[PDB]
Write a protein that binds this ligand. Structure first.
Ligand code: HEM
Ligand code: HEM
Lengths: 60, 51, 446, 99, 379, 78
């Protein structure tokens, strides 16, 4: 039975064109995911300080 | 240029067309990602969450 | 006006019969007045452990040196007096004894072969003399660069497995071998089910079967105390063994990837691809105009004195690659061109070269199976390996099936992004480092 | 008719004035280089001296005396057969490459 | 022992490049211009570095800083006008150099020629960015006209144009950027020139005849060094005549009126070197078509090696090709004049015909003429 | 491409006097002037004609532009 990594190699990693396709799509989704996650981390660390948190009290 | 109009060169073109298409796909995705082309990206799920 | 198909159909058919003890008698009958009768035994270095390695070579050395029925001189005297030629060859997977003789002398040839196989004296004094001889020949084989390089290739590629062992064996084993060990080797590995008696030329299959029953019947396939040797699959390890001896005039490099076994159907397309890669020697007349791109480039730039592609197959594994002898400063270029040809076949193979390779393979198969010695060798080895002698018509059909697509698929499976095994001898400093050779096994473009 | 216009060009082009012959002025591409290496030694040395003399004359911005100019009829195409053979062989190799 | 010139690595490189390089003995004065181009590059770099010591790139202080260089700085006027007229000398030498390459079939050295095309584009960009630095009326309005041409590019267009501008229009950001790019680019040119010389050394130098000269080679150092020194002295004669006797001959006067964004100058024209492309750009009505034609004018040179259909490398023994080549030269002169003159009825048709003739001569007429010549020579 | 192995040449003999033993400007005017006239005669036929066309175009264009600027009496007539 092929493992997950063996399936990854055969499907994508073997031919460098599919390897680069994996790289680029992962880059797009990883940019999205990491930016979202780290922004959440920093906002939590500074919850209640950042202007975005307190903008409502003074707008409108 | 007449040198490359033969059956064997047609066969080589057939062999390399899928790989060339994959390289073109890589280039298109790279361009969209690097420039954050919203025209294409906005249709992409969970990436449309940005902007 | 016979056609290649009709000629293939008209080839005499091999007849295989089995004695009750398990010996398989196979024959191909032709009108020739000469015949070749030989016993092919499924014994070799791959079936030997560390302690007894080289025992088969020892037994083959003293096989023709005497038997209980006929002393040492008697056997040679009979074989020569009837005009026959007696020869033996030992490989890592097979051992063979064959006698070239006239058809009318077939019964005596069968008698002598039976006496050699079964009633071998293995006398101690002959044992000591053959120990001396074997040590001297181990010293001699060191000169033969190609054999040394292929032994290194087997050692590195099949390290940790019986296949790594050389047929001759280490000198220490040769000096330490005893009559008890040789007798034990003969008892354990020389068995009727693992032996094939094969004949070619003017041999009647009924006559051969009757003679085998008369002479070879006694041999048995039972193992003493139920000690049965077990075949072991061998791991292929990507590795590099470099013996740098800059004194040596020219550098020998052998690079291989793991290949199919004997029975794998992929052997034919890989053989076609290797024919596409081709072979070159400086003596070759064709030179630059030779179709093989590697051969043409080597001739134009004088890159290599000799380059050949090999497809070495064992039961479960094989060594597929090339051996090139080249100057100290041309190893890198030759490696680049060889790997480039490999990758080009894997990715962008074309129909015309596939046709050329198929015709080359067809002609090689037909030419090799010419003469009683090659035909008998083919019969015995095919029975041992394929379990059957594949007819030339079947070979032709399988070759015809091969196409550019099949060649690309098989070459991708065996050659692309696969860790190679490299052996180097001589002035091999320019030989690329293993990381670079491995990088050459794949194309960033593809 | 055509020969008159061809003669006009031969005089208009100055390789006759420098003592050169038409094949001496050919651009040395790979086929031409192979043809040159295929030339007999007498012809090759004659070509080398002609080109050297032409280069020397151009260096001093001088032309050969009128009597010593090459003649349109006397001009001999030494390199044409070898170059044609080279081109034909290249064409055959390309044709085999095509299919 | 060994000769230090041969043995030492840097000395070895210098020796092979310049001292003992195998050189054709017949290469004429037209071949001297490349060394004149290198001399112009060195002189421009030094003069612009001494100008930069006194030049501030803020829009408030640029024009006053150039006036300070001219008046207060000791010998500053000499340096400033040396730089200004050296740009013109550089472009004159570049045009003569490319003309020599075209006439004598030097484009067969493919890599050298393509690197030269890259060098030409780089030098033109450097000159265009430099002219903006004085921040005169002509500088500002020429920058506005030329940079706005990029807006024609479909889709990306205004985004690229504003990215270059650093804002909505040409302003302080554009001037500072252009000073920085103008400073950096000449060094990139100095490296591309070395790559050029390496590629040329691989294939040697072509001769006026166009026939290989391995038989007749002369060491570079004794002969061609002195020839290049004489050429440099003559170039200095011309350039210094411009610098001292006629400092403001090749430059528009309106560059002495400080830039006013609210008033256009009476006429907006590029520097004399760029006028030939300006005429081609104006000839085509569509903006994108004009931009593409301006690009193709320079880029047609890349296609020159492909369009060579003659069997003889040089045009020395090709009279009809000579006539076509001098037709092309006259057409380029006509384009320069048309770029100088206003866009009105007489000049418009002249410029359109001239651009059509330039492209036709380069692309169609010359190869067919070369084929006809081959047929005439019994080829 | 070093000097030693550039090309293959055979049986060519060259005699070259030294610079100090020979005049720098031998017959600079006596032979230079006739040579220049010969070179100009051959070149002028090809180089000149194209530039003559430009002078005609430049003269015609300048005249035509001036004619355009001048008033047309008929327009203000009536
Ligand atoms: C290498 C080729 C170069 C070319 C073709 C070139 C061209 C020009 C041109 C046409 C001008 C405007 C002339 C005018 O004042 O009206 C200019 C100005 C200027 N350039 Fe150069 N330049 C080159 C190299 C350099 C370099 C390497 C520097 C380094 C600092 C430099 C510094 C300057 C400065 C500071 C100005 C403005 C000073 C002034 O207006 O007098 N230039 N350049
Ligand atoms: C700053 C820019 C440039 C510099 C410094 C430069 C320098 C040189 C030099 C020193 C040579 C040696 C031959 C000679 O001196 O005539 C040369 C040769 C050459 N250059 Fe460049 N060049 C420049 C731009 C160009 C351009 C724009 C082109 C073409 C578009 C070009 C194409 C060539 C060619 C074809 C040759 C061959 C000359 C021969 O046949 O001997 N170069 N260049």
């Amino acid at each position: 039975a092929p493992t997950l990594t063996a399936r990854l190699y055969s499907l994508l990693f073997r031919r460098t064109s599919t390897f680069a396709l994996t790289i680029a799509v992962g880059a797009l989704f990883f940019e999205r995911a990491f930016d979202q996650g780290a922004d959440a981390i920093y906002e939590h660390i500074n919850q209640g300080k950042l202007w975005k948190h307190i903008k409502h009290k003074y707008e409108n | 240029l007449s040198r490359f109009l033969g059956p064997r060169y047609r066969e080589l073109a057939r062999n390399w067309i899928p790989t060339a298409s994959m390289w073109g796909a890589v280039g298109a995705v790279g361009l969209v990602w690097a420039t954050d082309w919203r025209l294409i990206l906005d249709w992409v799920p969970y990436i449309n969450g940005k902007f | 006006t016979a056609t290649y198909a009709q000629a293939l159909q008209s080839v005499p058919e091999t007849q295989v019969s089995q004695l009750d003890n398990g010996l398989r008698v196979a024959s191909e009958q032709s009108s020739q007045p000469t015949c070749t009768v030989g016993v092919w035994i499924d014994a070799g270095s791959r079936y030997e452990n560390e302690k007894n390695n080289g025992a088969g070579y020892f037994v083959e050395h003293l096989a023709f040196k005497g038997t209980k029925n006929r002393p040492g001189s008697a056997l040679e005297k009979e074989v020569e007096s009837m005009g026959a030629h007696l020869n033996a060859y030992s490989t890592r997977e097979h051992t063979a004894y064959y006698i070239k003789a006239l058809s009318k002398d077939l019964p005596k040839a069968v008698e002598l072969l039976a006496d050699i196989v079964q009633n071998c004296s293995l006398e101690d004094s002959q044992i000591e003399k053959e120990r001396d001889v074997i040590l001297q020949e181990l010293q001699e084989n060191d000169s033969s660069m190609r054999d040394v390089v292929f032994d290194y290739l087997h050692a590195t590629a099949f390290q940790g497995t019986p296949l790594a062992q050389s047929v001759e064996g280490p000198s220490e084993n040769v000096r330490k071998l005893s009559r008890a060990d040789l007798t034990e080797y003969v008892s354990q590995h020389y068995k009727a089910p693992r032996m094939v008696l094969a004949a070619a030329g003017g041999v009647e299959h009924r006559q051969l079967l009757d003679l085998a029953q008369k002479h070879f019947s006694s041999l048995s396939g039972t193992y003493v105390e139920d000690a049965v040797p077990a075949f072991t699959p061998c791991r292929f390890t990507g590795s590099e063994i470099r013996h740098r001896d800059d004194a040596l005039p020219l550098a020998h490099v052998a690079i291989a990837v793991e290949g199919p076994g004997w029975a794998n159907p992929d052997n034919v397309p890989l053989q076609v691809a290797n024919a596409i890669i081709g072979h070159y020697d400086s003596t070759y007349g064709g030179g630059t105009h030779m179709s093989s791109t590697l051969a043409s480039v080597a001739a134009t730039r004088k890159l290599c004195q000799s380059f050949q592609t090999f497809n070495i197959c064992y039961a479960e594994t094989g060594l597929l690659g090339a051996h090139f002898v080249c100057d100290n400063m041309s190893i890198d270029d030759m490696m680049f061109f060889l790997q480039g040809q490999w990758m080009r076949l894997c990715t962008s193979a074309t129909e015309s070269e596939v046709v050329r390779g198929k015709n080359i393979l067809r002609n090689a198969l037909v030419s090799h199976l010419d003469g009683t010695t090659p035909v008998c060798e083919d019969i015995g080895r095919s029975l041992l390996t394929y379990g059957r002698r594949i007819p030339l018509a079947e070979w032709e059909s399988r070759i015809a099936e091969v196409d550019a697509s099949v060649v690309r698929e098989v070459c991708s499976k065996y050659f692309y992004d696969q860790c190679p095994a490299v052996a180097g001898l001589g002035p091999i400093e320019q030989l690329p480092d293993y990381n670079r050779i491995r990088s050459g096994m794949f194309w960033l473009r593809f | 008719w055509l020969e008159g216009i061809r003669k006009w060009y031969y005089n208009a082009a100055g390789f006759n004035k420098l003592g050169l012959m038409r094949d001496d002025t050919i651009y040395e591409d790979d086929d031409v280089k192979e043809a040159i290496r295929r030339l007999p030694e007498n012809l090759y040395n004659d070509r080398v001296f002609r080109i050297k003399r032409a280069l020397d004359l151009t260096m001093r911005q001088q032309i050969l005396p009128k009597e010593q100019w090459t003649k349109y009829e006397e001009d001999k195409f030494y390199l044409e057969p070898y170059l044609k053979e080279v081109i034909r062989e290249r064409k055959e190799r390309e044709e085999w490459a095509k299919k | 022992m060994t000769n230090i010139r041969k043995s030492h690595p840097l000395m070895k490189i210098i020796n092979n490049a310049f001292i003992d390089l195998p050189a054709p003995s017949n290469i004429s004065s037209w071949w001297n211009f490349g060394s004149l181009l290198g001399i112009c590059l060195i002189l421009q770099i030094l003069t612009g570095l001494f100008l930069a010591m006194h030049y501030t790139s803020d829009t408030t202080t640029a024009f006053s800083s150039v006036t300070h260089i001219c008046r207060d700085v000791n010998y500053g006027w000499v340096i400033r006008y040396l730089h200004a007229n050296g740009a013109s000398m550089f472009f004159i030498c570049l045009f003569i150099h490319v003309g020599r390459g075209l006439y004598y079939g030097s484009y067969m050295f493919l890599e050298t020629w393509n690197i030269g095309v890259v060098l030409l584009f780089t030098v033109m960009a450097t000159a265009f960015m430099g002219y903006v630095l004085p921040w005169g009326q002509m500088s500002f309005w020429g920058a506005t006209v030329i940079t706005n041409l990029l807006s024609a590019i479909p889709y990306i267009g205004t985004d690229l144009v504003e990215w270059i501008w650093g804002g909505f229009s040409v302003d302080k950001a554009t001037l500072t950027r252009f000073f920085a790019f103008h400073f950096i680019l000449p060094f990139i040119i100095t490296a591309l020139a070395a790559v050029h010389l390496l590629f040329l050394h691989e294939t040697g130098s072509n001769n006026p005849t166009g026939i290989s000269s391995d038989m007749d080679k002369i060491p570079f150092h004794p002969y061609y060094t002195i020839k290049d020194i004489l050429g440099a002295l003559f170039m200095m004669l011309i350039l210094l005549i411009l610098v001292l006797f006629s400092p403001d001959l090749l430059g528009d006067p309106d560059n002495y009126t400080p830039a006013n964004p609210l008033n256009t100058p009476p006429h907006i024209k590029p520097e004399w070197y760029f006028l030939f492309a300006y005429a081609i750009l104006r000839s085509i009505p569509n903006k994108l078509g004009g931009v593409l034609a301006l690009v193709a004018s320079i880029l047609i040179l890349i296609l020159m090696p492909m369009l060579h259909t003659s069997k003889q490398r040089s045009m020395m023994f090709r009279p009809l090709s000579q006539c076509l080549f001098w037709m092309l030269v006259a057409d380029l002169i006509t384009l320069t004049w048309i770029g100088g003159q206003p866009v009105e009825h007489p000049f418009i048709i002249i410029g359109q015909l001239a651009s059509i003739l330039y492209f036709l001569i380069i692309l169609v007429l010359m190869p067919i003429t070369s084929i006809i010549e081959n047929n005439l020579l019994k080829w | 491409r070093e000097f030693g192995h550039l090309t293959r040449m055979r049986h060519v003999i060259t005699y070259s006097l030294s610079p100090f033993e020979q005049r720098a400007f031998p017959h600079y005017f006596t032979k230079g002037i006739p040579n220049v006239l010969r070179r100009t005669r051959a070149c002028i036929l090809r180089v000149a004609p194209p530039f003559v066309v430009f002078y005609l175009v430049y003269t015609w264009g300048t005249q035509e532009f001036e004619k355009s600027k001048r008033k047309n009496p008929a327009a203000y007539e009536n």
